[PDB]
Structures are given as structure tokens and as C-alpha cells.
Ligand binder design. Structure first.
Ligand SMILES: CNCC[C@H](Oc1ccc(C(F)(F)F)cc1)c1ccccc1
Ligand SMILES: CC(C)C[C@H](N)C(=O)O
Ligand code: NA
Ligand code: NA
Length: 501
């Protein structure tokens, strides 16, 4: 089996897995829409009660799986629970990261496209709405937002070609393997990512207009609002963000952990990777978009902008703000270059589970596993590129509801079916430090009850609206992703047949 070469390489690759587009694009939007500091309390709580325990659980399952030659959940779920149904539930741990990858790599390619255009200065120029409109139109031409009745997207030729280059970049890393590809790239990307982010945070701090400063944005984000801790919509938002941001329930952490040696520590390593992400999220990610928006527009306007769109902040508002400053075009470039490296280190992570399945279970070489995985993702992404609201549908079913459901599933299998005491032992085995004894009770009683309650409220108060009050074209996307599940179910069926022959 492939293994991580260095300790630091492992940490940086795992942090590169988590530290992604979610830190800089998803988190600011979620927080702004949920009363800033009103969001943070549920967020911190969810991090302590859901994020941390599941991180250790996924590292545990991965290392346990890898020791026996299996990187993905179809096989790992079966190892923990010798039942046919465990293999089928395990498909979600291939399905989720595949579907997520299908739209994620595409968003990632927008950041490269924008980076290029901002570096070369092929960007709009201002002559409040006269400031935003040219940048709105710039993004709308790029991705091809529908102008009329038809739910059809028309991406520019540049966007399409940049998507191809992005696929090629992802492949060039992944084809070199774990230590020589993913690890080596992480050691380059992460320091760069941190430097650019710190630079941009510092630069944003210096912004002031007659409407406010950056500090006003931080005050909005860090003033606890106790009159919102009763809204279930905020708690759903916070827990969802925690899963997405930490790459939990994507089977991606598990797959990375399957290249960790049987004896090596996962307790401190896991905690470090999780804490590195939260610092990049709340300190770095939280200090760029919102404070800049609040500084130019005030709190009320910044929230309203964050509500009328989620790519409004990162692709429209921020570059618009930057263009009003000296060297703003280059500042835009640094923003989009930061985003590109944030995305890239995470997109290689959510394609690796499919690659590892093909290698481990169907005994394909790395070359063919990577190329076939890329081909599947490349082809499928045409739905995201050309069909309006296809991105939102995949992001909901796989990257939002799917991950929470899968987190609960993997927790139940590992802690309730495999055995709580066996699970605990497997977590702590070889650890530099031990997990606090309190977390056993959290993992076994608190976390599962909390997620189960959350999913029941979710499926009764929120999913009826999405199932019923959306455009008919969502069924094309639903149909296709259900098809992907059946296809993956079929590959698992072939994998066990091949094992017998
Ligand atoms: C414009 N429609 C998309 C809604 C938006 O989707 C997103 C999907 C992916 C990402 C990112 F960039 F991957 F983090 C960020 C946002 C979203 C989803 C959930 C919560 C906030 C925003
Ligand atoms: C799907 C995951 C790899 C996403 C990543 N954790 C992020 O915050 O962008
Ligand atoms: Na993250
Ligand atoms: Na990343």
C-alpha cells in the first residue's frame, strides 16, 4: 500500500483536504445570513460536539481500513459490519465525494479563470450599483447565467477551456500518487495559501469608507446574539457548515487516513488538522469577505448582498471593492489565486476515494484509476456547466443533507455495531495523546442523538419545500445522480465477484 512519507506532509495534506473553498466562500455567506455572532455559537458548539469526534472517528476507520488494504467505505463498512447492507450504505462514501467533485472542480476552475483575467487585467472598470453591475455582468458572461426564460447556462469558451486545464492540473497531481503527488503538492500549496490569506487579511483591515471600516464587519461576526439560538434553521446551517468545512461525511478523510500506517498516531494529527482548518476559517476566511463588504456598504447592505447570492460575495462584491483601490486588479488576482489553491488541495481529496476504490477493489493501476475517475467527473460536470440549478441540487443532496446523513451512518456503524469499546480502542491506539474520556459519551450518546434530531427536523420542515417548490429541471439532476449511485452500487457488486474469481 501507498503511505504518507512525512508527518508534516500528512498534516498538510489533511489540512489541504479541509481548508478549501468552504473556508472563504461558504462560511462567510452562512454566517452573514445567520446573524453573524448568532451563527458562531451554534458553530463553535457543533465543532466541539460533532466536528472533533467525527474527525477522530474517520481517521480511525481509514487507518483501520488501510491496514487491511481497503481505502473506501464499501469495503470498510463491511469490515466493521459483516453484512451485505453495509456494502450498500458504503456506496454513499463514494457517491458523495464524486457528486461533490462534479461541481466543486467547476467552481475551482472559475477561480483560475478569474485569476488569469485579473493578472492580465482583462477585467471591468467602474465608471453603489454602478460599482457592482460590471462585475455582476463579468461573472454572468463567464459562467453563462440564463438571460431569458430557458433554464440553460451558456459558459464562455474561456470558462470551458479553463475547466479542462483545471482537470489536467488535478490529474497531474493525482497520477503521481499519495507521497509524490498529493503530499508534495500540499507542502507547496499550504504555506503559499496561508501567506496570501494573511496578506489579504492585513490589506482588508486597512479599508475605510464613509460607510465603515473592516472592524465593523468583525464586530458583526463576533457579537453573540442570544435571540437566535432558538431558530432550528441556524443550527442546521452551522452543523452543515462544520461537515462541509472539515470534509466530514465525504469519505475523503477516511481515504486519506487509509494511507496512514497501522501504528502511527491519529489523535493529535487529527486534532491538528481540524484546528488548522478552523483557524483558516474563522480568522482568515472570516476576516476577508465580510469586513470588506461591511467597510464599503455597511452591515445591512452586506447581509442583503450575501442573501441575494452566495457567489455574490467572492466573485462580484470583493473584486468590485478591490478595483476601487491602488493595485486592486492584482489584489483580485491574489484573492482568486488563493481560492484556486484552496480548491485544488480539496478537489484532489474528493476524487481520491474513487481512485482508491478502483485501485483497491477492482485492482486497476493508479494511471487508469486516475484517468477513468477524471473522465467520469469531466463528463458529468457538463450537467453542472449547462443546466441551471444543477449545482444547487448536487450541493444539497450530496454536500449538505448527504454528508450529515453519512456522518450519522458511519458513527452508528463504528460505535454501535462494530462496538463502542472496540471503536474507542482503535481511535486511541498509537496516539501521542489520548482522547479525553468525556468524548466516549459524546461519540456514543450526544453526537448520534443530536444528528438524528437535526435530520428529522430537516426532513419535515425544509426538504418538502425543495422537493416541491423547485423548477422541473431539478429532476434531470436528481435522475442523473441517482444513476451514479446505481452505477457505483454495480461496481461494488463487480468488486466482490472479482474477489471470488
Ligand atoms: C448560488 N447557489 C449556490 C448556493 C451555495 O452553494 C455553494 C456551493 C459550493 C461552495 C464552495 F465554494 F464549494 F464552498 C459554496 C457555495 C450555498 C450552499 C449552502 C450554503 C450557502 C451557500
Ligand atoms: C468537499 C470538501 C473537500 C470541501 C472542503 N472541506 C472545503 O471547505 O472547501
Ligand atoms: Na474547510
Ligand atoms: Na483545500
Amino acid at each position: 500500500r501507498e503511505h504518507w512519507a512525512t508527518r508534516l506532509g500528512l498534516i498538510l495534506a489533511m489540512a489541504g483536504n479541509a481548508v478549501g473553498l468552504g473556508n472563504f466562500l461558504r462560511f462567510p455567506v452562512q454566517a452573514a445570513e445567520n446573524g453573524g455572532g448568532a451563527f458562531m455559537i451554534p458553530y463553535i458548539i457543533a465543532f466541539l460536539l460533532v466536528g472533533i469526534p467525527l474527525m477522530w472517528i474517520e481517521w480511525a476507520m481509514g487507518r483501520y481500513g488501510g491496514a487491511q488494504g481497503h481505502g473506501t467505505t464499501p469495503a470498510i463498512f463491511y469490515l466493521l459490519w459483516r453484512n451485505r447492507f453495509a456494502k450498500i450504505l458504503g456506496v454513499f462514501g463514494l457517491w458523495i465525494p464524486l457528486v461533490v467533485a462534479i461541481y466543486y472542480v467547476y467552481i475551482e476552475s472559475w477561480t483560475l479563470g478569474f485569476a488569469i483575467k485579473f493578472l492580465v487585467g482583462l477585467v471591468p472598470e467602474p465608471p453603489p450599483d454602478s460599482i457592482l453591475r460590471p462585475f455582476k455582468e463579468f461573472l454572468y458572461s463567464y459562467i453563462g447565467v440564463p438571460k431569458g426564460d430557458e433554464p440553460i447556462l451558456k459558459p464562455s469558451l474561456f470558462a470551458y477551456i479553463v475547466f479542462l486545464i483545471t482537470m489536467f492540473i488535478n490529474v497531474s497531481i493525482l497520477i503521481r500518487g499519495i507521497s509524490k503527488g498529493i503530499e508534495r503538492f500540499a507542502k507547496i500549496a499550504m504555506p503559499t495559501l496561508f501567506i496570501l490569506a494573511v496578506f489579504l487579511v492585513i490589506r482588508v483591515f486597512l479599508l475605510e469608507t464613509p460607510n465603515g471600516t473592516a472592524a465593523d464587519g468583525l464586530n458583526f461576526l463576533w457579537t453573540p446574539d442570544f435571540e437566535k439560538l432558538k431558530d432550528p434553521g441556524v443550527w442546521i446551517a452551522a452543523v452543515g457548515q462544520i461537515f462541509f468545512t472539515l470534509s466530514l461525511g465525504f469519505g475523503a478523510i477516511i481515504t486519506y487516513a487509509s494511507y496512514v500506517r497501522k501504528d502511527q498516531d491519529i489523535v493529535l494529527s487529527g486534532l491538528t488538522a481540524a484546528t488548522l482548518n478552523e483557524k483558516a476559517e474563522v480568522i482568515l476566511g472570516g476576516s476577508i469577505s465580510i469586513p470588506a463588504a461591511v467597510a464599503f456598504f455597511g452591515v445591512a447592505n452586506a447581509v442583503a448582498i450575501a442573501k441575494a447570492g452566495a457567489f455574490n460575495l467572492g466573485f462580484i462584491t470583493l473584486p468590485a471593492i478591490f478595483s476601487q483601490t491602488a493595485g486592486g486588479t492584482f489584489l483580485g488576482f491574489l484573492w482568486f489565486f488563493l481560492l484556486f489553491f484552496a480548491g485544488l488541495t480539496s478537489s484532489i481529496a474528493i476524487m481520491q476515494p474513487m481512485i482508491a476504490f478502483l485501485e483497491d477493489e477492482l485492482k486497476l493501476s493508479r494511471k487508469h484509476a486516475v484517468l477513468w475517475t477524471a473522465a467520469i467527473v469531466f463528463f458529468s460536470a457538463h450537467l453542472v456547466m449547462f443546466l441551471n440549478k444543477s449545482l444547487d441540487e448536487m450541493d444539497f443532496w450530496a454536500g449538505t443533507i448527504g454528508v450529515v446523513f453519512f456522518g450519522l451512518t458511519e458513527l452508528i456503524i463504528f460505535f454501535w455495531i462494530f462496538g463502542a469499546d472496540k471503536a474507542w480502542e482503535e481511535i486511541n491506539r498509537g496516539g501521542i495523546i489520548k482522547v479525553p474520556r468525556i468524548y466516549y459519551y459524546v461519540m456514543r450518546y450526544i453526537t448520534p442523538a443530536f444528528l438524528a434530531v437535526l435530520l428529522v427536523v430537516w426532513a419535515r420542515e425544509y426538504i418538502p419545500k425543495i422537493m416541491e417548490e423547485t423548477h422541473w429541471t431539478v429532476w434531470i439532476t436528481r435522475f442523473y445522480i441517482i444513476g451514479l449511485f446505481l452505477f457505483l452500487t454495480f461496481l461494488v457488486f463487480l468488486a466482490e465477484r472479482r474477489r471470488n474469481h
